[PDB]
Amino acid sequence: AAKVVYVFSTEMANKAAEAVLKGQVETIVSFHI
Amino acid sequence: MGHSSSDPVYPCGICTNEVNDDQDAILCEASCQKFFHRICTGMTETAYGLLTAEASAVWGCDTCMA
Ligand SMILES: [Zn+2]
Ligand SMILES: [Zn+2]
């Protein structure tokens, strides 16, 4: 049983929150290209 | 980490001061398993709220990330 988790630096956590607040993504793990 | 019957009060990996029960704490889950005051890391309250809510997300210290 193995699981992938995504590791966020402080910079990346803050950036991801901004992306959610700007309605650019649904959640902070909504990775895309 | 930090949920046992016999955990010490943990010092912040940045300021060395205790991370108390009425303070936001963030655990480095990259490797070190050090605790830190949210404030000391520079993470916003909103970012902390979102990251702590997401099961597939963890945080990594600036040391561990380099
Ligand atoms: Zn601190
Ligand atoms: Zn660490």
Numbering used by the authors:
A (entry chain B): 173 to 205
B (entry chain A): 332 to 397
What does the study report here?
Pygo and BCL9/Legless transduce the Wnt signal by promoting the transcriptional activity of β-catenin/Armadillo in normal and malignant cells. Molecularly, BCL9/Lgs proteins function as adaptors between Pygo and Armadillo/β-catenin, by binding through their homology domain 1 (HD1) to the PHD finger in the C terminus of Pygo, and through their homology domain 2 (HD2) to the Armadillo repeat domain of Armadillo/β-catenin (Kramps et al., 2002; Städeli and Basler, 2005). We show that human and Drosophila Pygo PHD fingers associate with their cognate HD1 domains from BCL9/Legless to bind specifically to the histone H3 tail methylated at lysine 4 (H3K4me). Therefore, this is a prime example of histone tail binding by a PHD finger (of Pygo) being modulated by a cofactor (BCL9/Legless).
